[PDB]
Design a protein around this ligand. Sequence first.
Ligand SMILES: [Cl-]
Ligand SMILES: [Cl-]
Ligand SMILES: [Cl-]
Length: 180
Amino acid sequence: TKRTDAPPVMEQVGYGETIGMLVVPKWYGVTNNNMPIMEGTGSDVLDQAAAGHYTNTQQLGEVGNFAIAGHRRTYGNSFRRIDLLQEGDEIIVSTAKTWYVFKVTGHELVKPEQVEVIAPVPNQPDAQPTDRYITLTTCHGSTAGEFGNDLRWIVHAKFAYWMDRSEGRPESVLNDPGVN
Ligand SMILES: [Cl-]
Ligand SMILES: [Cl-]
Ligand SMILES: [Cl-]
């Protein structure tokens, strides 16, 4: 029961509070694949093996860009294998009420000052948004890749559909990432 009308918008929460869980089907067998997403991008969030929401980006479900940061090398849950994501791969956020399903549009390798990658319209800081995106960010090295940090690996995914979590879940989801 994939819904294509506008999804529910998450309300902004305080720093360090949990927004949901990140599930990426290509990371089944790689990580525990149930990475919490929390407000804020300090190490107090990312060291918890959680993804952090850039606080000046849009809320989950909101028109614009919900951007999250993750460590590349954390245990249990991380963005280690961000490099496996190709066009059309699913990026799934679970909240208490809702499954948000995004589909990868592309990736970028950028310098960390290239903040246009997390603008409301990805890579277009001057543009007003129409679509709903998620953006995942992590470190990458020009020489050392996974083990370097002169660059940032960026994945963009455009909203595809949503589901009421009490009524169903995506077919790719192999087990409940959370509780009910
Ligand atoms: Cl931030
Ligand atoms: Cl959209
Ligand atoms: Cl490097």
